[PDB]
Symmetry: D3
């Protein structure tokens, strides 16, 4: 229940605006252990796997709601979000979407 | 709908406490383009016009509620607010108050 | 009603993780005057008394809810909290718990 | 000797990258009083007049050297500078260049 | 040689400007363990004892030079210093001044 | 001369202390484009390739000197360094060490 893991990815707009570090810091500060990371349509992305108790739903709270017009200040989208097109970041919706998203993006050796 | 514009002003207490930059940064980070700025009862103020989709209601969310005792951490008043007398900042209430507040404080050449 | 005072304490996990300064800064930025401070089971702690209008309930808002899985980003636990065991910080629950907690931890000369 | 004043300006590249607030904050934190501000070839700029003891030479130290390849971390160019073309910011070289730069960019009523 | 200890104190001007937390954070980030702390002419002060390898000379580097007109950006005085009157902070000059300053300001039980 | 590239790596102590994001942010803010990234004796590491004019010598300046007792505040080691054992970060010494370090740690497809 603390071996729990989610997929996170800095969308091209996050990368282009210089927000990769800021996003990582946010998770480091909550205590989540980073487990894997790669820097792969239009723009490069930063795919990450993070681990900790409740990381899946907590990190969704941390991101804020899909529509940054409504996203709470303190959240990533609440602090940095533009519009819904350029919403900076993706994080797995639930435990099933996490397991599938992780495996899609990584070889299993790549993950701790 | 993205040519939208609001009036913002750092009240004398914001200026006196050294919060002008912090306030601007907050808006720069959300992606709003600054459009005009001047530094004019008791204490100097910093009047600004900002532009972007939904800037009017988003920036109100960003400020927090009038009563910083109740203002959410992450918002300007939630992070920096003292009492309701010294509430740091003013931002236009709605699209009508914005158009009027902008024109009151600026010559039209002064605005982009 | 502005002579109001609360007890705050950085739990051993807050101290061990290097968060004392960050916690103080948060309160300094809201305008609360620090009134007393000492750095005393397992791990050292930082006990503080803070003063200002509504400091008791405001600082509880600032901390976030007991369960950092649910704690709002922008709050201390929302930004830094791990699990409910390691919840970083304690703050007096109400005006009675404040007066008792202050007196328990300080000699009265120690308080301003 | 504390009525001293300099001209500062965020070049178009500073504005485009969202660094106006960060730059102001830097000066607010040193204790300089902002005295005037306007937001006017290619890109908008932010012209400012700042006041305090030794503000002219101190702010040059704060900016760092013209060549950000050599600019010291902690300085504006040391933290944010790209190349010498895009060097973010301009500040008056000496007390004579300050008086001339201020008057060039402002009406005298505009300055405190 | 890592049991080394210095005295540090936030002068009244540091306290009045809300810089206690910022100062502590700086030391926490370098890895120094805080060992004791009290919050005692004109204005309250924050006296601290910090411990770590070379803490005495390192923390002097961290403060910057006595004359903030010349103090390096990145240092406390370089980032926050006003003039030499209001120079924010005091730190022991050398290992002898440290041992004496610590004992002057603390009972020995008060120190870890 | 702007296609220049260096190797950077957050040592296990940087990772364990939660400094990966902070380190990346530092480079994003200088304008360097991240080009590749993986998260691989004792402790996990974060290997990165960064690109920009003079990135090799600039990033060495940004890190500070090998001996954090002497490392300048504003630099990574100056702000976060412990002792020379735990010096947080590695960066290629020169253009030859960069080309070799990059190829050692990456497949060439992995690099942009
Ligand atoms: Cl999404
Ligand atoms: Cl209002
Ligand atoms: Cl509790
Ligand atoms: Cl220039
Ligand atoms: Cl002194
Ligand atoms: Cl090395």
């Amino acid at each position: 229940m603390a071996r729990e893991r989610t997929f996170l990815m800095v969308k091209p707009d996050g990368v282009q605006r210089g927000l990769v570090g800021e996003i990582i810091s946010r998770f480091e500060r909550r205590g989540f252990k980073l487990v894997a990371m790669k820097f792969f349509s239009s723009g490069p992305v930063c795919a990450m796997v993070w681990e900790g108790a409740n990381v899946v739903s907590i990190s969704r709270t941390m991101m804020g709601v899909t529509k940054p017009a409504e996203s709470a200040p303190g959240t990533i989208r609440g602090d940095f979000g533009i519009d819904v097109g350029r919403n900076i970041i993706h994080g797995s919706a639930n435990l099933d979407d996490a397991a599938r998203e992780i495996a899609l993006w990584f070889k299993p050796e790549e993950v701790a």
